[PDB]
mmCIF file with all atom_site columns, N, CA, C and O in Angstrom:
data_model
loop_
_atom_site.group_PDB
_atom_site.id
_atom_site.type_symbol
_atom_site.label_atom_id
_atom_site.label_alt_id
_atom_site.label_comp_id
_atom_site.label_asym_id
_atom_site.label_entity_id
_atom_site.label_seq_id
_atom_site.pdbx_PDB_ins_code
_atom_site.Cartn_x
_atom_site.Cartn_y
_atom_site.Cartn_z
_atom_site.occupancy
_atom_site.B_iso_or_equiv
_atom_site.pdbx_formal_charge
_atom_site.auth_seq_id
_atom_site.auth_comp_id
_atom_site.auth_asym_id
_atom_site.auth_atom_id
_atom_site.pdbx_PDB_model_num
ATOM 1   N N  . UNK A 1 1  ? 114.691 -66.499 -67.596 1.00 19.70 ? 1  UNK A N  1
ATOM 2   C CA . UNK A 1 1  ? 114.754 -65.108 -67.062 1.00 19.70 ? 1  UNK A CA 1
ATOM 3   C C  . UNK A 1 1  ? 115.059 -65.166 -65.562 1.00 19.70 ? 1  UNK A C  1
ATOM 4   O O  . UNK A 1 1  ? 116.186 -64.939 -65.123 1.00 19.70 ? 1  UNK A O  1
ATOM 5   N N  . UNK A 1 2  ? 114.163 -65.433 -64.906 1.00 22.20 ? 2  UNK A N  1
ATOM 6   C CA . UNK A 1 2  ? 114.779 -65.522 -63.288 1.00 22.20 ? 2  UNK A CA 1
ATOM 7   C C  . UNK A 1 2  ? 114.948 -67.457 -62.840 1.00 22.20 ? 2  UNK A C  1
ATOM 8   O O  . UNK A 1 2  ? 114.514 -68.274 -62.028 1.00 22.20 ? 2  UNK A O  1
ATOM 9   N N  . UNK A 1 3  ? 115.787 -67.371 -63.904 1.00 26.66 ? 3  UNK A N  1
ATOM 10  C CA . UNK A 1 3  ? 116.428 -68.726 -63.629 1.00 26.66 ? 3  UNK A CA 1
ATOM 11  C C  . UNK A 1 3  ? 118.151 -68.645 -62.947 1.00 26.66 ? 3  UNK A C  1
ATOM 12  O O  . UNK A 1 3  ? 118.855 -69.540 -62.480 1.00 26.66 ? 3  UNK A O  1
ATOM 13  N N  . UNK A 1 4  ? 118.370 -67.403 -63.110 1.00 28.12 ? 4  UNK A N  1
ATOM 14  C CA . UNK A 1 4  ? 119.330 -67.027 -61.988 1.00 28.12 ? 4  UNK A CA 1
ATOM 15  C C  . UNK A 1 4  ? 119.550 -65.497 -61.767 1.00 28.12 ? 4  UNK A C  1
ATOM 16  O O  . UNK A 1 4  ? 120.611 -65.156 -61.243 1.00 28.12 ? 4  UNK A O  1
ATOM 17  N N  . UNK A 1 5  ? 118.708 -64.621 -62.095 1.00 28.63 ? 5  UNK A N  1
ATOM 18  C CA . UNK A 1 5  ? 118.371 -63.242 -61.513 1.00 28.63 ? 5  UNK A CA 1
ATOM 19  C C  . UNK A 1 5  ? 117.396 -63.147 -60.536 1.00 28.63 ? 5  UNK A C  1
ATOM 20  O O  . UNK A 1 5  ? 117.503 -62.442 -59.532 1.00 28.63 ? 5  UNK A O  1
ATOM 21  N N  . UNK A 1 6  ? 116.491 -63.812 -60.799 1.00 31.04 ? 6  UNK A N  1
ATOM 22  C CA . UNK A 1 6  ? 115.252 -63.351 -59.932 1.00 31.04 ? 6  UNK A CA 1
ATOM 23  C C  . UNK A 1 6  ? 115.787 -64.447 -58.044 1.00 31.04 ? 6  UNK A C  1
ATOM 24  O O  . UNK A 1 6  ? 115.513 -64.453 -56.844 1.00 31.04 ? 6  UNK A O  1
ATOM 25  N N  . UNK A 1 7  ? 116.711 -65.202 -59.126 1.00 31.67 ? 7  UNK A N  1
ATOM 26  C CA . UNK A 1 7  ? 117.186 -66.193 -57.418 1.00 31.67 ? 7  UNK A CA 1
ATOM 27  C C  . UNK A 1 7  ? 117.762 -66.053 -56.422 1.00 31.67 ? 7  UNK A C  1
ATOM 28  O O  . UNK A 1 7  ? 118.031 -66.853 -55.526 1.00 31.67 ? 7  UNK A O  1
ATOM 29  N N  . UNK A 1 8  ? 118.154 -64.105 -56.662 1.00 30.52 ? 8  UNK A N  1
ATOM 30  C CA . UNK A 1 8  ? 119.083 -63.507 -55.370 1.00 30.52 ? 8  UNK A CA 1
ATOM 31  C C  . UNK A 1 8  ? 117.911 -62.081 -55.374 1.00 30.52 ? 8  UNK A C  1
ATOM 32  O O  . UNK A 1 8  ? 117.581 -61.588 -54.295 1.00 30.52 ? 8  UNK A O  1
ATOM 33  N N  . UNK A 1 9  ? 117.644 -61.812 -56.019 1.00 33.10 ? 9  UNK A N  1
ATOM 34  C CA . UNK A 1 9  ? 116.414 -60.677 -56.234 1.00 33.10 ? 9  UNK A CA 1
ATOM 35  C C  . UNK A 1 9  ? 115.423 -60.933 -55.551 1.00 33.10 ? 9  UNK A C  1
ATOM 36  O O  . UNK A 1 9  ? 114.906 -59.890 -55.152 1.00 33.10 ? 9  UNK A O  1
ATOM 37  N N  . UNK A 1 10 ? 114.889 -61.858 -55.211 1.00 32.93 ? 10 UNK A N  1
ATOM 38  C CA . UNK A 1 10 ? 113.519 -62.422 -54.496 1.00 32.93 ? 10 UNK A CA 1
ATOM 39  C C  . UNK A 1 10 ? 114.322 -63.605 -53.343 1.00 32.93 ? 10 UNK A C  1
ATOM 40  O O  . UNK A 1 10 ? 113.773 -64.178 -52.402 1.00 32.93 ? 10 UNK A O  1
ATOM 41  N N  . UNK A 1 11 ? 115.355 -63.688 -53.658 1.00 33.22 ? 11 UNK A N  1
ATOM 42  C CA . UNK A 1 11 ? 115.679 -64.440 -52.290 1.00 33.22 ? 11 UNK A CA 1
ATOM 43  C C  . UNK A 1 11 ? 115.161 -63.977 -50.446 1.00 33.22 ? 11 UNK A C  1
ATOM 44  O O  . UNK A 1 11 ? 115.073 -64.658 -49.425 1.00 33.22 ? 11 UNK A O  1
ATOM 45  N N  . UNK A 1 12 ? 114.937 -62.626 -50.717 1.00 34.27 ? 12 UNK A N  1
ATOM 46  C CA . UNK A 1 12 ? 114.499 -62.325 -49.269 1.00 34.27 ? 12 UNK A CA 1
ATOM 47  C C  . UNK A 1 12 ? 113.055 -62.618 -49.110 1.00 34.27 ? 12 UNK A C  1
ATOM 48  O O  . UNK A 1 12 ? 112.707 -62.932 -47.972 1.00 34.27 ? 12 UNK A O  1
ATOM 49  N N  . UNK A 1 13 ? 111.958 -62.565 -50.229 1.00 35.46 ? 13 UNK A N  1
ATOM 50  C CA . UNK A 1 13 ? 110.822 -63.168 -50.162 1.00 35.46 ? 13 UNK A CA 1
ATOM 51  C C  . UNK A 1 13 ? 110.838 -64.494 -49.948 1.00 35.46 ? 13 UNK A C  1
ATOM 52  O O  . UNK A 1 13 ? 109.937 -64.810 -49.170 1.00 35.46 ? 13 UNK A O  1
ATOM 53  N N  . UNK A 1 14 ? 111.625 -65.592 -50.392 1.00 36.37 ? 14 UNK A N  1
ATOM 54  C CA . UNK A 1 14 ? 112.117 -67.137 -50.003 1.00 36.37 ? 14 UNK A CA 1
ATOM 55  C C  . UNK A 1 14 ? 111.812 -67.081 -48.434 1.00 36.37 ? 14 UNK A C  1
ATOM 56  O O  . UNK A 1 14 ? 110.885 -67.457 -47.716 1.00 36.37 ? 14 UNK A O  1
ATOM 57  N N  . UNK A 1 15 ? 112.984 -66.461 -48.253 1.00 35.40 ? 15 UNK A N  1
ATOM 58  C CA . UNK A 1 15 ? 113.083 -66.363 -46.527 1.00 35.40 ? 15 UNK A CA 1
ATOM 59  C C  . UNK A 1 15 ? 112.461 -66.396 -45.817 1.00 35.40 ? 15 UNK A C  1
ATOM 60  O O  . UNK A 1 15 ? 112.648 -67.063 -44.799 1.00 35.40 ? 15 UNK A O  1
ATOM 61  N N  . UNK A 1 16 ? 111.084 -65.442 -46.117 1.00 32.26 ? 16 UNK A N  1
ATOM 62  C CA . UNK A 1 16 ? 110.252 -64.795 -45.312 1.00 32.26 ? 16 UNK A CA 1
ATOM 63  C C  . UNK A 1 16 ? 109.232 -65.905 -45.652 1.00 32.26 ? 16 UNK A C  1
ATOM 64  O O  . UNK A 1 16 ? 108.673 -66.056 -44.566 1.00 32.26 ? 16 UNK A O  1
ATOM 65  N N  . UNK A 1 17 ? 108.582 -66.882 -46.627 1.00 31.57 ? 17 UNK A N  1
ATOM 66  C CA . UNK A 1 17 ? 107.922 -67.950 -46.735 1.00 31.57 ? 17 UNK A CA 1
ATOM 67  C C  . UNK A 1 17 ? 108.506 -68.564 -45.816 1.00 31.57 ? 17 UNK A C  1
ATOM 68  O O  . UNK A 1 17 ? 107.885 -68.794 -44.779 1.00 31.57 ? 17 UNK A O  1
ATOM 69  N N  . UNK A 1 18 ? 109.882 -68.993 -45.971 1.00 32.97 ? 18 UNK A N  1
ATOM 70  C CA . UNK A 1 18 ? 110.139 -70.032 -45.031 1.00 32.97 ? 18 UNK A CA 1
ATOM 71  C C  . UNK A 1 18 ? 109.904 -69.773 -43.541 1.00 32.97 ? 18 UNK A C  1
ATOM 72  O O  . UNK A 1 18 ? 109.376 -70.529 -42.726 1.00 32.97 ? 18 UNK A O  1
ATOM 73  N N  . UNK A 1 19 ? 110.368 -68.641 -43.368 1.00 31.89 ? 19 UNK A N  1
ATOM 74  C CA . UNK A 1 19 ? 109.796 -68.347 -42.293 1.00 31.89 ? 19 UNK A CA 1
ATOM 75  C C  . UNK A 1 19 ? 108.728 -68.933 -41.386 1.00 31.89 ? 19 UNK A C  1
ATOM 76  O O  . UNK A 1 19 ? 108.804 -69.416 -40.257 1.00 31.89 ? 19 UNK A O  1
ATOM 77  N N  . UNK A 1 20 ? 107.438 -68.698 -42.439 1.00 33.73 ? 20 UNK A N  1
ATOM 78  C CA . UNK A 1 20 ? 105.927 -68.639 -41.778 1.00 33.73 ? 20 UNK A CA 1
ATOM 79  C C  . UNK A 1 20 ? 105.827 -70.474 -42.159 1.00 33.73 ? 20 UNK A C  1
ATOM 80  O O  . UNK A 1 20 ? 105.287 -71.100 -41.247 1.00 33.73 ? 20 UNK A O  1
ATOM 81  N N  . UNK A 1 21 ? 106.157 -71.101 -43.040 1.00 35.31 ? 21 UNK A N  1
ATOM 82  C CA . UNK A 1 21 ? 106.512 -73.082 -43.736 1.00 35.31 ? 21 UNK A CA 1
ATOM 83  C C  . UNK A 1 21 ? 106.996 -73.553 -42.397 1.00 35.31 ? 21 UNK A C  1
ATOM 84  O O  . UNK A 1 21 ? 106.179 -74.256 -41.801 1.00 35.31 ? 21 UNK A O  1
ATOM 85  N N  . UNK A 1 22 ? 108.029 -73.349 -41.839 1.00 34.65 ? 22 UNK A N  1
ATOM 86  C CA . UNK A 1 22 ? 108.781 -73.464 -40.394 1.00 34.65 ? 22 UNK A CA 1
ATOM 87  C C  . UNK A 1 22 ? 109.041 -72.284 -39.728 1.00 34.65 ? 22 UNK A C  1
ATOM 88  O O  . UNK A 1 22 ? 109.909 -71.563 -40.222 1.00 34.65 ? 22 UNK A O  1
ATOM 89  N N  . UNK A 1 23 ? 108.444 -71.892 -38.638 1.00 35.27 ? 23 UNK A N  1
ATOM 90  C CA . UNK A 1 23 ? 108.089 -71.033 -37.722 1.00 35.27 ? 23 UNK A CA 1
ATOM 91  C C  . UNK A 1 23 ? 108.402 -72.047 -36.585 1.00 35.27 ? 23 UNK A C  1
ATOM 92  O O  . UNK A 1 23 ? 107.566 -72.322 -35.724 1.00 35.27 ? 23 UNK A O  1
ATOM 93  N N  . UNK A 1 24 ? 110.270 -72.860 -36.644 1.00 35.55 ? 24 UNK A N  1
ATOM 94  C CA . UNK A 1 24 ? 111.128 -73.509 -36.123 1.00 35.55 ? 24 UNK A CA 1
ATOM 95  C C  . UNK A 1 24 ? 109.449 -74.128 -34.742 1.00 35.55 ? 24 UNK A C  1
ATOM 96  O O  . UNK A 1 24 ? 109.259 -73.879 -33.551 1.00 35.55 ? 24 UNK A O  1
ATOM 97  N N  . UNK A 1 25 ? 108.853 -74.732 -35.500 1.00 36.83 ? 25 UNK A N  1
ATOM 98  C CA . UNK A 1 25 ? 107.934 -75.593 -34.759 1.00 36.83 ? 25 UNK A CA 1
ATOM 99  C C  . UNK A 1 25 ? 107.099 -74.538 -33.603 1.00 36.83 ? 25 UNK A C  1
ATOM 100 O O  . UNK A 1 25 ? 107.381 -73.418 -33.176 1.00 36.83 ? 25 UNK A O  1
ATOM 101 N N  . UNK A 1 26 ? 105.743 -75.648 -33.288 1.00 37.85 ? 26 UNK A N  1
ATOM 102 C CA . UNK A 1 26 ? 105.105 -75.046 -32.103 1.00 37.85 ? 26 UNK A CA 1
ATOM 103 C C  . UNK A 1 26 ? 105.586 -74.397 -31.150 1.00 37.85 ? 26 UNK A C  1
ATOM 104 O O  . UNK A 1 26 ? 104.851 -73.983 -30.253 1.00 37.85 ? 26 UNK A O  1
#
């Protein structure tokens, strides 16, 4: 099911994890 729908659908939630994962260092 979101083995390739949910992977552009929730891609902006990705982002926003990565975001806060790398917060491009101290």
């Amino acid at each position: 099911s979101e083995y390739a729908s949910k992977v552009d659908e929730y891609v902006g939630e990705v982002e926003n994890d990565l975001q806060k994962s790398k917060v491009a260092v101290s």
